[PDB]
Amino acid sequence: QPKQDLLNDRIILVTGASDGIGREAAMTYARYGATVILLGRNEEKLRQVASHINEETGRQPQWFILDLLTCTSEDCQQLAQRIAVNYPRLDGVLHNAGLLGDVCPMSEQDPQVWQDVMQVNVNATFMLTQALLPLLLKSDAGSLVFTSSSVGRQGRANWGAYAASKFATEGMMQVLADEYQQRLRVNCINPGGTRDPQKLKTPADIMPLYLWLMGDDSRRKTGMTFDAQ
């Protein structure tokens, strides 16, 4: 599909960058020319992913530490302040950080795990969004992408807090898209089943959508949720 320089001169921040889909997305964005900013809780994990992208790409991403389970609104503003000293805008923010929590009936759901899933997937993702909006408004056409799931649109047995949180994520995305008509592109990606493990798709397999949402080919698309597979 996309040309190899699709994301030249796009600065894109990726949360949950240290492993899984986040790690693939950061690497993929860099491969396609982006200046990537990695966000995660583990500095040694982040440094390792940055080194790999540099070896593979020749340019080394910066990383910043944030723990969504515990971060405050103050921590997010300070993170945004640190970014802004190094970077003039954010062209993209990919919210790929998340907690799955318990997969079990509602009667069995652990209430602290429930609280933790809502804190990471909803509340912290919101506070981080709020902190980063000014930088995103500095883009020619900033793009904000949340991670959803099939159970964010149709609740199913056993999916408890994760489902509740992904519904909330669809709602948050919709409110934002309505507030930022013209000004920001705000959408969700549903990556689907990525991780019978040999039957599933690899993060690499689902990347085209992640690329599309950050490149110019999706320029006036907002308020939608997209299925990666």
Q: Virtual CA dihedral for 196, 42, 112, 21, nearest 10 degrees?
A: -30
Q: Is 210 a catalytic residue?
A: no
Quick one: tokens of 197? 């493990």
Q: Is 157 in the site for its own copies (CB under 8 A)?
A: yes
Q: Is 122 in the site for its own copies (CB under 8 A)?
A: yes
Residue number with CB closer to its own copies (105 or 192): 105
Pattern 185-214, binding to its own copies, x per CB under 8 A? ------------------------------
Quick one: tokens of 191? 């990556």
Which of these is catalytic: 29, 32, 162, 180? Answer: 162
Q: How far apart are CA 183 and CA 64, in angstroms?
A: 26
Which of 73, 78, 150, 194 binds its own copies (CB under 8 A)? It is: 73
Q: Is 97 in the site for its own copies (CB under 8 A)?
A: no
Where b means 16+ CB within 10 Å and e means fewer, 61-83 reads bbbbebebeebeeebbeebbeeb
Q: In this structure, are residues 66 and 18 in contact, taking their beta carbons and an 8 Å threshold?
A: no
Instruction: Report which residue type is found at 202.
Output: T
Q: Is 150 in the site for its own copies (CB under 8 A)?
A: no
Q: Is 23 in the site for its own copies (CB under 8 A)?
A: no
Q: Name every residue whose Cβ is closer than 8 Å to that of residue 92 and which is 6 or more positions away in sequence.
A: 10, 11, 12, 13, 29, 34, 139, 142, 143, 144, 145, 214
Q: How far apart are CA 44 and CA 63, in angstroms?
A: 10
Which of 133, 145, 207, 214 binds its own copies (CB under 8 A)? It is: 133
Taking contact as CB under 8 A, which single stretch among the options 10-18, 100-108, 198-206, 212-220 is the one that binds its own copies? 100-108
Q: Is 111 in the site for its own copies (CB under 8 A)?
A: yes
Catalytic residues: 162
The residues binding its own copies (CB under 8 A) are: 73, 105-107, 109, 111-112, 114-115, 118, 122-123, 126-127, 129-130, 133, 151-152, 154-161, 163-179
